Amino acid sequence: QEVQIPLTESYCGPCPKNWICYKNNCYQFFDESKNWYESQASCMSQNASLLKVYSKEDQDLLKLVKSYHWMGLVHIPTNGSWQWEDGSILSPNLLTIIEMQKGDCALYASSFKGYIENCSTPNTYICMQRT
């Protein structure tokens, strides 16, 4: 229950070949810089989607990620608020959003930060899939 022995070792749920698996989520980082739209397409091309942050606990490895990367966060002007691709509202206390450029997309950065960027700016991206 607490101890790490070879008996308590599980396989990490179904993930694309050569992806990161952590707490029944799969992740891959892409060094091929794309605008947000091309990035979204790339993630969906792999039956996946741009990174959603839903829990500091279950995605704590996001604390160690260097540089800035596209994630699935987008704006809505009528509501003056952010949400994910899947229409999910951003949990109010999860991300610190910083106003870096005028744009309707955000880059994930370490310490659960979201830096607002122009969607047309090419950038590295993170795909995530739920196991």
Partner: protein, 263 residues
């Protein structure tokens, strides 16, 4: 005056060996406001949450930067990263990053324009190369790192502002006029202004409503008067019985006041 936020990070070596310590001095509207080291952050209280994380980041990253300088000259050397951001009266922003080595500038970046700049100077240029090479190639910094640095700083400034720690409180001066006694039928008149913030004040004797030249007047410096206030004085020599011809004039923060000689 604008609003200043500044971070002053500092790392040390002893014969090429980068010491575990480092020290960040945070200045808010030009006043010391935080001192962090490796351990934790101390104002002058766990609202010092995000800054412990951030500034330990930079500290570590700056120990790495110093390890790529090849001075080797024996003994104690400092390296410094100073990030500054300002919010101007007019809503335009200012922001820069500076590196000092042994307390001398050798590299700047304007964060508004993203334009690096170095001293012309053999050592200054080799240093700058050492660190600009470490920044591009090893640390692998995107243009976006410098946009974030700029934005991180300002959101922080706006956050401190909002919290209401910064009071742009005017303290108007106390004024007093006095006179030095008869020597050869003449008097010195002294105007004194004290306990006033901000620092900027106009103080001048006038004859029949017209300022005296700076030359026929004698001037106090603007000295500190405690609690963050200042004091100063101006003085002139006049004839006995020309007293109500002279007045002391003062502007402080849109308050234009006038004090005559006690007759």
């Amino acid at each position: 005056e604008p609003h200043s936020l500044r971070y002053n990070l500092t790392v040390l070596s002893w014969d090429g060996s980068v010491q575990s310590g480092f020290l960040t001095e945070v200045h808010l509207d030009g006043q010391p406001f935080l001192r962090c080291d490796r351990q934790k952050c101390r104002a002058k209280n766990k609202t010092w949450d995000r800054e412990t994380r951030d500034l330990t980041g930079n500290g570590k990253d700056l120990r790495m930067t110093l390890a790529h300088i090849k001075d080797q000259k024996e003994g104690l050397h400092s390296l410094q990263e100073i990030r500054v951001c300002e919010i101007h009266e007019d809503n335009s922003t200012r922001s820069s990053q500076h590196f000092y080595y042994d307390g001398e500038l050798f590299l700047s970046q304007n964060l508004e324009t993203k334009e690096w700049t170095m001293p012309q100077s053999s050592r200054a240029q080799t240093l700058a190369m050492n660190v600009r090479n470490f920044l591009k190639e090893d640390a692998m910094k995107t243009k976006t790192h410098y946009h974030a640095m700029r934005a991180d700083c300002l959101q922080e400034l706006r956050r401190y502002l909002k919290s209401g720690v910064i009071l742009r409180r005017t303290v108007p001066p106390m004024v007093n006029v006095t006179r030095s006694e008869a020597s050869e039928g003449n008097i010195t008149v002294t105007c004194r202004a004290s306990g006033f913030y901000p620092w900027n004040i106009t103080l001048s004797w006038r004859q029949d409503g017209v300022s005296l030249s700076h030359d026929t007047q004698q001037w106090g410096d603007v000295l500190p008067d405690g609690n963050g206030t200042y004091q100063t004085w101006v003085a002139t020599r006049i004839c006995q019985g020309e007293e109500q011809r002279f007045t002391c004039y003062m502007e402080h923060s849109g308050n234009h006041s006038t004090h005559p000689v006690p007759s």
